Symmetry: D4
Subunit: 120 residues, 8 copies
């Protein structure tokens, strides 16, 4: 897997907040974020377990790759405003982990290309 | 209308190395053809340590129940767990995740050709 | 193939009184006929406080899926939750429980006759 | 509800211990415990959530009733031996809660009778 | 111990809230609550550990005694309003447990008397 | 309260371990510990909530007074061997907190005297 | 180490509040607090793990001097007003621990001096 | 701070296990580990809070240097056996966090040298 890593991000939201969260991301947010970060493995909300939670997993070639990409995203005024206006009010708690794939785990997703965005 | 189960096992200290070794040598060849859609199998490097995290795709919760029941009843799987994984386990939990509209689609079922390759 | 869903809600401090009042006055008449088999609806006196605990029985997973989908699509339920219950909520969790062989069978389905006899 | 109370007991077990736990109770333990305590509302193991967990709810007419029935159970040599031999090795953590029914919650299960035990 | 019990209540407060919580009980709240419940073993705030936390231990003869006295307290409008106005804005999370004394643990205090309120 | 402090120590034990724990401290443990540390406010085990837990509260003049007395107890071979033989096998988790009494909270108990032990 | 002690304070903040927290401390707050408490070993915010969290470690000669210095800090209206206006709205949860250094851990750092400010 | 990071590692130990833990690290372990990782900011055990816990903070120039140096330590048989024999029996739970220093936080300490 050549030092590939996966960041799992886990956000606890205000009660019944996941629906608006996903609405913002599908309409606006994921077009900002996915081209920059690159390799979305999955973006979910919880149905059974800890409720009002969003779970998303992103693949990077290594930690440096993650660092460079998250800094580019963080420096985007469009991203900053999008979060401030739409997502910030829904947040309660945030946690992340760095996950390393076992040898039989699937390979990294390919990088999101602008043709993928046009295909949505 | 796919669903994803996330299973989160906390292991005994420094037990992730052996845990992965058993699954590559023997365990995943039993488990993956039965459950069908492995999205990711990981161990933590930063955060809660000595933890393995695995995400399994199913068409719905009934599909999950049937497939897990098939696995659970296999003596090969039972023996595999007893002899190799059971002593490694400390805590287990799971959650059911629902993909957002832009999240990647339901993967194909693991095939015999995938194993032999 | 019976399953029981346990739902555990942590409320804002001292919020259970209003929570149960809403469900007595309005809420349970909406929810219980749809979901079908209430096993119990409680609040805590010892343990984690400002917590409500409710268990709902279903014949199977698909029975749960269909009945919860009906409930959540009802605009009367959506508005009830939003106006009365959502401001009292702090945290929500649920578990899927499977009954051991000796555990009681499912309650019968809630009938209009039951609602009328309240 | 005439001061009715419900005790929820939540036991976390050794990994994959619920099967043996259930076996011991269906074969032997519940025949001891249910007639003494009186009103089993439900006895479960988890399938989604915290795994290796058993959840059981017992109904009592009031706090005196619960104390009296539990004291009788704890004093029984048969119960003490059954727990020590069969259940004690499977236990990791135990918690309980005292629950109060809302007005619309079902009434107490009837007391378990010998006629119930015989036709199990 | 003649089979007495102790209830430990643990309240997590909004940040830096314990000083005001303590002031409300010193000026007003404990005069309402302590004569009704009976036997305050201790009322504390945390300095090391979980911060912004108050811990209080109440003695009772048994769980039925506890439920009778707490019912009396909760029915009092003066208590309900004292809590609602002053304490409720400070609360974040609440928990309790029932503790049984070991045989060498001290006896539980006598009941709070009106002479104690006036002293 | 003259800067009085209280330490609450919370020990989670192996299941059904509190009975044996209490027996050991009744017969021998508390006779070593209480004179040295001085002011036992309460020593309990849990009945409802987190089960298999012991909770004990000790009063001190300050955190230095806590440090000196605990340092004395910890150095005692009699206490080291009692804990190793009888208590250590029963322990699962240990935590402690420093609590400050509110103005209306009772005063600290007096120092345990040898007369008390008699 | 002659009974040197370290206090670790752990604050969970409102989401995305660490940036404002650090800004208030770099511009105003740390100039009040550090000269009084004396020995800042580290002030951090989390990047991986529990997010929106600030971790800070304060060294003291002992718990008596910790108490004396913290009581001085807390009685300062400048500190009180700084916290009420700038930090209070950002706080969600606070915890602390008392840590004892192992023999090989770095020694007690020197007091922060006006020349350092 | 030039992208410096700090790793905080938090180990929960078996009851009363911190004394033996420290003894091994002072007698044998920290001689192995510190020269390799380079920048120990602090190595502690708890006295008040969660008990039977050791907390240690390691400085790194960035996560890339962290990964390089930890990979070097992990591959050392001397470290592997030291851990397996002496420390693993004391461990119950492990967690870690990546901490970023604020502008006023102390700088990256120097690398540990064989003279030290």
């Amino acid at each position: 897997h050549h030092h590939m890593i996966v960041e799992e991000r886990i956000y606890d939201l205000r009660p019944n907040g996941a629906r608006e969260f996903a609405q913002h991301f599908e309409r606006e947010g994921i077009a900002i974020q996915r081209p920059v970060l690159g390799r979305l493995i999955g973006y979910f909300y919880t149905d059974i377990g800890p409720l009002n939670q969003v779970v998303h997993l992103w693949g990077y070639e290594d930690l440096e790759d993650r660092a460079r990409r998250r800094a580019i995203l963080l420096a985007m005024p469009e991203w900053q405003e999008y979060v401030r206006k739409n997502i910030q009010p829904l947040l309660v708690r945030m946690q992340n982990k760095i996950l390393l794939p076992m040898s039989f785990s699937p390979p990294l997703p390919p990088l999101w290309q602008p043709e993928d965005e046009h295909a949505r």
